[PDB]
């Protein structure tokens, strides 16, 4: 007799040609680890709720993993998913992929600096970039990788010379104010 | 055993290339502030229900904000979203964007005056237009920005000369009656 | 632990370029008047459940209406929606739109007579057509507006001469039997 | 606090240009007759749950039927839907439509024999085909209407000569084994 | 008053031209066998929940099966679905389809080895491949069926000569490290 | 630190260079970057193999031997990496 919302579970599939509904694996693993740790029900219910979030190749991995060992716990299943799909990158490769990341031909430069900031957090978690220079490399990698121009270059090089460098939100404010 | 409705939560993403499901940020913030203020559950549940309404770049901001400070409250998270995505416009820029807004080449003029009225409310909230002339600028900005013609121009200039000017609903009634 | 259906609320938007999900306004108003009259919860809950059924320009009207008067009741909100979107047609215009309605170039004539019957109910509610001639004008407006031919014309003119004229369902049966 | 499935109600519309969500009428009537007979709630709730399953022209029939008689019961509403949309075919026409049904240019012959078997059940319910020859007409109408060839023709004519003829499932097994 | 997730039931249809929502039959049968064995409700409820997961040709089989015997149990219904749609392959055909499976022209070779591993599990369940050589045939069928090249061929032939051969996850790790 | 990191990573084998000369040129830029504290010394070997493999005009079984060395565990010193690249130069 009462109406209610209905959150669509985060489906994952592991296909390279991912459909518009389907998350990157790290977001799905955050959902699956919630089901594994948090939810109060037995492991048989947990396995079912994890499997329902999976489609295509990733669901086939769930079948393979259970077929080898029906006595397995969901925590060990997620270790198999982390091993097959969870990214493995080295310090060399995380540094290179951050530095090689330029503004794409269709991007607004405000969207590029946000995309680039996700790669910086990735690289800091690998300990591939020291946190105490993250601001320097933000201004540098924006200026080296963006399709930049006009007085935005002047304001960014001024900020590089200013002393205390921008946080990410402040650098976005500058780039947005020039986007107008 | 009972059937019920199922409201799709308002998803937001912050991409400039927004998908057809995805709201403008101000509508999403109205939903997220409901979850922050109203709902009775602890901050850990509130964070989860806010994060589930987010997809793509805006979800990456939720991860960044939590990673800097896991002790943060949802109210302070929404202040970070307001700062990154919530619009910052000055009196000069809100006045200019209202006045520069013409009827688009495919629009019916009845749809244009409704679109234009949203920009007037925006400008009044910045205190960029005095409320006591909002009617005058509606008739003027319709007449200056629309692809207008015929006896609708005559009726609108007559209304400009009439003394007491139209409210928005009355101006729409006139423009709709000429749309037939 | 139990599974259940999930009725998608009837979304409305008021755009002329309406998306395939989105109802004509009169169907949405039937849903919104159910929420206004029937549902047991306070006006603050009613406002929220009405607003969740709205998207795009029609949601912007809900914001405008509430911003002018936060003390308003949902019944008075629906009067503002009726005034802005609810159709206003005169006896002259309802008579003309019924009579001007021909079978569209892609229509099957069985679909045309059903479309046409909706316009007759509209015109009868304006008192623009006397109920006691509705059958006569159905056969006439089918015969004058359809892409008709063959022995279906003969059977329809025979029915016009028969004495007691078809009801709508009987006229559809005839047109369907010739559709085969 | 608990997650659950959410079955999408079977929407029907009665348009000839039916959208990919929308069932053939006979499947919708099976759902609507469940709501009419089975569900425990009063007729006012039953009318609402039937109307929510309807979209476009079929919803307009629900409005017409209720407008003529607000005192009507849902059973009598479904009799009006059966009369307008429910198929009326004679023995001659059901026999002809079964026999005229050939394999379509894009069909696999295994899909054709399943499509054809639905038309045989239809014809048997009209008493247009005696049940005691249904097997004979399956092999004949497959062989006369399919884009058949190779040793599948030989195996089918052998089965026609074998004595005890295939059931539908056995005929599908043969046609599937040649599909490989 | 509370919000909740809403898992979309796994729809199946049995059309060869399957829509993007629709599972392979073996995944649907895993859902339908859960409804048949596990769920506590009577067989009449079980039949309804199975039928709601079906669309198009597969729903027509549910109608045929019930029409022949209304006294049937859901377990015997799923035996009819297994017989009509569940795959029947011999040892010869499962061996041939595994060996004939090459990397498709658009595939990344990491996706190909995962696709190929599903066919190996299929063949092992038919007892068509001895488990004690599954690793040998993985490296061979990758090397014979892939669009392979570069030092990945050298590393794979080295692994073939190494003594203890890769598990599937280890072979994927190698192929992924060369995908970079 | 930003500019020394960028100039090291942006340094590819020039169109006329032998790859043995390129890895020596590249090693001078690594010492420069380590003196700015722009690269941690404890990963200098990893970035040598990576920046050779990403910046060189490499090919043949030299790529295989270099990726093998990247997987080997204990990575080459500069002199050992030059020995490998010289032995393939022949």
PDB file of C-alpha atoms in Angstrom, chain E residues 27-163:
ATOM      1  CA  UNK E  27      21.762 -18.868 -16.390  1.00  0.00           C
ATOM      2  CA  UNK E  28      17.962 -18.611 -16.537  1.00  0.00           C
ATOM      3  CA  UNK E  29      17.618 -22.294 -15.571  1.00  0.00           C
ATOM      4  CA  UNK E  30      19.796 -21.614 -12.494  1.00  0.00           C
ATOM      5  CA  UNK E  31      17.268 -18.908 -11.490  1.00  0.00           C
ATOM      6  CA  UNK E  32      14.222 -21.061 -12.304  1.00  0.00           C
ATOM      7  CA  UNK E  33      15.617 -24.051 -10.336  1.00  0.00           C
ATOM      8  CA  UNK E  34      16.103 -21.691  -7.354  1.00  0.00           C
ATOM      9  CA  UNK E  35      12.363 -20.770  -7.612  1.00  0.00           C
ATOM     10  CA  UNK E  36      11.439 -24.457  -7.987  1.00  0.00           C
ATOM     11  CA  UNK E  37      13.523 -25.924  -5.123  1.00  0.00           C
ATOM     12  CA  UNK E  38      14.152 -23.116  -2.650  1.00  0.00           C
ATOM     13  CA  UNK E  39      11.196 -20.728  -2.399  1.00  0.00           C
ATOM     14  CA  UNK E  40       8.660 -21.668   0.335  1.00  0.00           C
ATOM     15  CA  UNK E  41       5.347 -20.825  -1.460  1.00  0.00           C
ATOM     16  CA  UNK E  42       2.902 -23.338  -3.136  1.00  0.00           C
ATOM     17  CA  UNK E  43       3.351 -24.643  -6.727  1.00  0.00           C
ATOM     18  CA  UNK E  44       0.725 -22.142  -8.038  1.00  0.00           C
ATOM     19  CA  UNK E  45       2.895 -19.217  -6.826  1.00  0.00           C
ATOM     20  CA  UNK E  46       6.057 -20.966  -8.152  1.00  0.00           C
ATOM     21  CA  UNK E  47       4.474 -21.347 -11.644  1.00  0.00           C
ATOM     22  CA  UNK E  48       3.589 -17.628 -11.650  1.00  0.00           C
ATOM     23  CA  UNK E  49       7.111 -16.512 -10.632  1.00  0.00           C
ATOM     24  CA  UNK E  50       8.679 -18.765 -13.297  1.00  0.00           C
ATOM     25  CA  UNK E  51       6.255 -17.478 -15.997  1.00  0.00           C
ATOM     26  CA  UNK E  52       7.008 -13.825 -15.123  1.00  0.00           C
ATOM     27  CA  UNK E  53      10.723 -14.452 -15.917  1.00  0.00           C
ATOM     28  CA  UNK E  54       9.730 -15.603 -19.485  1.00  0.00           C
ATOM     29  CA  UNK E  55       9.048 -13.535 -22.656  1.00  0.00           C
ATOM     30  CA  UNK E  56       8.278 -14.386 -26.334  1.00  0.00           C
ATOM     31  CA  UNK E  57       8.817 -18.022 -27.579  1.00  0.00           C
ATOM     32  CA  UNK E  58       9.887 -19.361 -24.173  1.00  0.00           C
ATOM     33  CA  UNK E  59       6.667 -17.977 -22.593  1.00  0.00           C
ATOM     34  CA  UNK E  60       4.681 -19.753 -25.332  1.00  0.00           C
ATOM     35  CA  UNK E  61       6.328 -23.035 -24.258  1.00  0.00           C
ATOM     36  CA  UNK E  62       5.166 -22.360 -20.666  1.00  0.00           C
ATOM     37  CA  UNK E  63       1.581 -21.945 -21.960  1.00  0.00           C
ATOM     38  CA  UNK E  64       1.795 -25.146 -24.088  1.00  0.00           C
ATOM     39  CA  UNK E  65       3.203 -27.211 -21.191  1.00  0.00           C
ATOM     40  CA  UNK E  66       0.531 -26.021 -18.740  1.00  0.00           C
ATOM     41  CA  UNK E  67      -2.286 -26.474 -21.316  1.00  0.00           C
ATOM     42  CA  UNK E  68      -1.386 -30.189 -21.794  1.00  0.00           C
ATOM     43  CA  UNK E  69      -1.409 -30.817 -18.018  1.00  0.00           C
ATOM     44  CA  UNK E  70      -2.676 -28.188 -15.493  1.00  0.00           C
ATOM     45  CA  UNK E  71      -1.818 -30.675 -12.652  1.00  0.00           C
ATOM     46  CA  UNK E  72       1.966 -30.508 -13.487  1.00  0.00           C
ATOM     47  CA  UNK E  73       4.619 -29.439 -10.896  1.00  0.00           C
ATOM     48  CA  UNK E  74       7.281 -26.772 -11.624  1.00  0.00           C
ATOM     49  CA  UNK E  75      10.075 -29.396 -11.527  1.00  0.00           C
ATOM     50  CA  UNK E  76       8.483 -31.228 -14.494  1.00  0.00           C
ATOM     51  CA  UNK E  77       8.013 -27.869 -16.303  1.00  0.00           C
ATOM     52  CA  UNK E  78      11.771 -27.203 -16.012  1.00  0.00           C
ATOM     53  CA  UNK E  79      12.410 -30.716 -17.419  1.00  0.00           C
ATOM     54  CA  UNK E  80      10.384 -29.649 -20.506  1.00  0.00           C
ATOM     55  CA  UNK E  81      12.445 -26.414 -20.773  1.00  0.00           C
ATOM     56  CA  UNK E  82      15.720 -28.440 -20.379  1.00  0.00           C
ATOM     57  CA  UNK E  83      14.512 -30.765 -23.154  1.00  0.00           C
ATOM     58  CA  UNK E  84      13.538 -27.954 -25.604  1.00  0.00           C
ATOM     59  CA  UNK E  85      16.280 -25.337 -24.907  1.00  0.00           C
ATOM     60  CA  UNK E  86      18.978 -27.054 -22.757  1.00  0.00           C
ATOM     61  CA  UNK E  87      21.990 -28.028 -24.908  1.00  0.00           C
ATOM     62  CA  UNK E  88      22.394 -31.718 -25.912  1.00  0.00           C
ATOM     63  CA  UNK E  89      25.986 -31.934 -27.273  1.00  0.00           C
ATOM     64  CA  UNK E  90      27.971 -35.196 -27.699  1.00  0.00           C
ATOM     65  CA  UNK E  91      31.679 -35.801 -26.858  1.00  0.00           C
ATOM     66  CA  UNK E  92      32.577 -35.439 -30.590  1.00  0.00           C
ATOM     67  CA  UNK E  93      30.729 -32.109 -30.911  1.00  0.00           C
ATOM     68  CA  UNK E  94      32.006 -30.604 -27.621  1.00  0.00           C
ATOM     69  CA  UNK E  95      35.620 -31.483 -28.568  1.00  0.00           C
ATOM     70  CA  UNK E  96      35.146 -30.020 -32.064  1.00  0.00           C
ATOM     71  CA  UNK E  97      33.527 -26.761 -30.851  1.00  0.00           C
ATOM     72  CA  UNK E  98      36.315 -26.225 -28.304  1.00  0.00           C
ATOM     73  CA  UNK E  99      39.089 -26.854 -30.888  1.00  0.00           C
ATOM     74  CA  UNK E 100      37.371 -24.872 -33.718  1.00  0.00           C
ATOM     75  CA  UNK E 101      37.031 -21.801 -31.420  1.00  0.00           C
ATOM     76  CA  UNK E 102      39.540 -19.167 -32.621  1.00  0.00           C
ATOM     77  CA  UNK E 103      39.989 -15.535 -31.469  1.00  0.00           C
ATOM     78  CA  UNK E 104      37.327 -13.435 -33.246  1.00  0.00           C
ATOM     79  CA  UNK E 105      38.564 -10.571 -35.493  1.00  0.00           C
ATOM     80  CA  UNK E 106      37.626  -7.814 -32.947  1.00  0.00           C
ATOM     81  CA  UNK E 107      38.650  -9.661 -29.729  1.00  0.00           C
ATOM     82  CA  UNK E 108      41.513  -8.762 -27.440  1.00  0.00           C
ATOM     83  CA  UNK E 109      43.411 -12.039 -26.828  1.00  0.00           C
ATOM     84  CA  UNK E 110      42.771 -11.715 -23.021  1.00  0.00           C
ATOM     85  CA  UNK E 111      38.997 -11.793 -23.726  1.00  0.00           C
ATOM     86  CA  UNK E 112      39.505 -14.767 -26.108  1.00  0.00           C
ATOM     87  CA  UNK E 113      41.286 -16.919 -23.474  1.00  0.00           C
ATOM     88  CA  UNK E 114      38.426 -16.230 -21.008  1.00  0.00           C
ATOM     89  CA  UNK E 115      35.780 -17.162 -23.661  1.00  0.00           C
ATOM     90  CA  UNK E 116      37.773 -20.281 -24.500  1.00  0.00           C
ATOM     91  CA  UNK E 117      37.991 -21.280 -20.800  1.00  0.00           C
ATOM     92  CA  UNK E 118      34.153 -21.342 -20.610  1.00  0.00           C
ATOM     93  CA  UNK E 119      34.161 -23.873 -23.485  1.00  0.00           C
ATOM     94  CA  UNK E 120      36.765 -25.996 -21.675  1.00  0.00           C
ATOM     95  CA  UNK E 121      34.513 -26.241 -18.559  1.00  0.00           C
ATOM     96  CA  UNK E 122      31.629 -27.247 -20.853  1.00  0.00           C
ATOM     97  CA  UNK E 123      33.759 -29.982 -22.469  1.00  0.00           C
ATOM     98  CA  UNK E 124      35.056 -31.313 -19.097  1.00  0.00           C
ATOM     99  CA  UNK E 125      31.442 -31.650 -17.831  1.00  0.00           C
ATOM    100  CA  UNK E 126      30.641 -33.828 -20.935  1.00  0.00           C
ATOM    101  CA  UNK E 127      33.799 -35.875 -19.938  1.00  0.00           C
ATOM    102  CA  UNK E 128      35.039 -34.988 -23.456  1.00  0.00           C
ATOM    103  CA  UNK E 129      38.454 -33.733 -22.145  1.00  0.00           C
ATOM    104  CA  UNK E 130      40.402 -35.435 -19.277  1.00  0.00           C
ATOM    105  CA  UNK E 131      40.943 -32.844 -16.450  1.00  0.00           C
ATOM    106  CA  UNK E 132      44.605 -33.943 -16.104  1.00  0.00           C
ATOM    107  CA  UNK E 133      45.418 -32.422 -19.592  1.00  0.00           C
ATOM    108  CA  UNK E 134      43.196 -29.274 -19.395  1.00  0.00           C
ATOM    109  CA  UNK E 135      46.280 -27.011 -18.917  1.00  0.00           C
ATOM    110  CA  UNK E 136      48.059 -28.514 -21.940  1.00  0.00           C
ATOM    111  CA  UNK E 137      45.032 -27.932 -24.181  1.00  0.00           C
ATOM    112  CA  UNK E 138      44.633 -24.357 -22.810  1.00  0.00           C
ATOM    113  CA  UNK E 139      48.167 -23.382 -23.928  1.00  0.00           C
ATOM    114  CA  UNK E 140      47.805 -25.304 -27.237  1.00  0.00           C
ATOM    115  CA  UNK E 141      44.326 -23.931 -28.089  1.00  0.00           C
ATOM    116  CA  UNK E 142      45.387 -20.371 -27.176  1.00  0.00           C
ATOM    117  CA  UNK E 143      48.509 -20.759 -29.384  1.00  0.00           C
ATOM    118  CA  UNK E 144      46.590 -22.493 -32.258  1.00  0.00           C
ATOM    119  CA  UNK E 145      43.389 -20.353 -32.163  1.00  0.00           C
ATOM    120  CA  UNK E 146      44.572 -16.856 -31.086  1.00  0.00           C
ATOM    121  CA  UNK E 147      45.783 -13.978 -33.325  1.00  0.00           C
ATOM    122  CA  UNK E 148      49.010 -14.181 -31.206  1.00  0.00           C
ATOM    123  CA  UNK E 149      52.501 -12.688 -31.837  1.00  0.00           C
ATOM    124  CA  UNK E 150      55.647 -11.010 -30.365  1.00  0.00           C
ATOM    125  CA  UNK E 151      57.403 -12.163 -27.108  1.00  0.00           C
ATOM    126  CA  UNK E 152      54.006 -13.397 -25.827  1.00  0.00           C
ATOM    127  CA  UNK E 153      54.460 -16.432 -28.164  1.00  0.00           C
ATOM    128  CA  UNK E 154      57.983 -16.918 -26.715  1.00  0.00           C
ATOM    129  CA  UNK E 155      56.718 -16.698 -23.076  1.00  0.00           C
ATOM    130  CA  UNK E 156      53.830 -19.106 -23.863  1.00  0.00           C
ATOM    131  CA  UNK E 157      56.111 -21.693 -25.579  1.00  0.00           C
ATOM    132  CA  UNK E 158      58.582 -21.253 -22.682  1.00  0.00           C
ATOM    133  CA  UNK E 159      55.688 -21.961 -20.261  1.00  0.00           C
ATOM    134  CA  UNK E 160      54.780 -25.056 -22.395  1.00  0.00           C
ATOM    135  CA  UNK E 161      58.432 -26.212 -21.887  1.00  0.00           C
ATOM    136  CA  UNK E 162      58.691 -25.009 -18.190  1.00  0.00           C
ATOM    137  CA  UNK E 163      57.373 -28.227 -16.595  1.00  0.00           C
TER     138      UNK E 163
END
